[PDB]
Amino acid sequence: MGPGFDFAQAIMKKNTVIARTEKGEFTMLGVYDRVAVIPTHASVGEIIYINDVETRVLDACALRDLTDTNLEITIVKLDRNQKFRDIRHFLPRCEDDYNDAVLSVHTSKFPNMYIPVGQVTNYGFLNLGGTPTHRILMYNFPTRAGQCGGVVTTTGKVIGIHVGGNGAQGFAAMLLHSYFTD
Numbered sequence: 355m356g357p358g359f360d361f362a363q364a365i366m367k368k369n370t371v372i373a374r375t376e377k378g379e380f381t382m383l384g385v386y387d388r389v390a391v392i393p394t395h396a397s398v399g400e401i402i403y404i405n406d407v408e409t410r411v412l413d414a415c416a417l418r419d420l421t422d423t424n425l426e427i428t429i430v431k432l433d434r435n436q437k438f439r440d441i442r443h444f445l446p447r448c449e450d451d452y453n454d455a456v457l458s459v460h461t462s463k464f465p466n467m468y469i470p471v472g473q474v475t476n477y478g479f480l481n482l483g484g485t486p487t488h489r490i491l492m493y494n495f496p497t498r499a500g501q502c503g504g505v506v507t508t509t510g511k512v513i514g515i516h517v518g519g520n521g522a523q524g525f526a527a528m529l530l531h532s533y534f535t536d
C-alpha cells in the first residue's frame with residue numbers, strides 16, 4: 355500500500371522460502387549464496403524441507419552472544435542448486451530502535467501476509483519460552499502461532515526475524531551484518 359510494504363514485498367518475492375522441520379512450517383529468510391536464517395526453536399536437523407522438497411543441511415549454527423546467551427537465530431547452509439540474491443547490504447551494523455516496521459510472513463497457512471507493526475524498541479533481554487535471550491526487538495502487535503521466522507523490515511533495512519509473542523506484544527531476534535561475514 356506504500357513504500358514500507360514495497361520494500362517488504364521485494365524481500366519476500368526473492369529472498370524467502372517455506373522451511374518445514376519436525377517442529378512445523380516457518381518463513382525462512384535467504385541472506386546470500388545458500389545461507390538462510392530460521393528461529394533456533396525450529397530445531398533444524400540433517401534434513402529440512404524447502405518449498406516441500408527434501409534438502410540436505412550442509413551446516414547449522416545456533417548463535418549465542420559472547421556472554422554465552424541464546425540469540426534465537428540459527429544460520430543454515432542448504433544443499434540447494436541455486437543462490438539467494440545477496441541482501442547483506444540491507445542488514446544493520448548495530449543494535450537500534452526503528453520506526454514504521456512491517457512483519458512479512460509466507461507459509462501454506464499464511465501466504466502473502468504483511469503486518470504494519472509500527473515502532474520497534476531495542477528491548478534487549480527476554481525470557482523466551484523459559485530461555486534467557488538477548489538482542490530482542492519488541493513491537494506492539496498481537497502476533498500469533500504461524501508467524502515465527504517472519505521478516506521484520508523498515509524501508510531499506512532487514513532488521514530481524516519474528517521469534518515469539520505474549521498475546522499483546524511480538525518479539526524478533528536482531529539480524530546484524532556481522533553474523534554473515536564469510
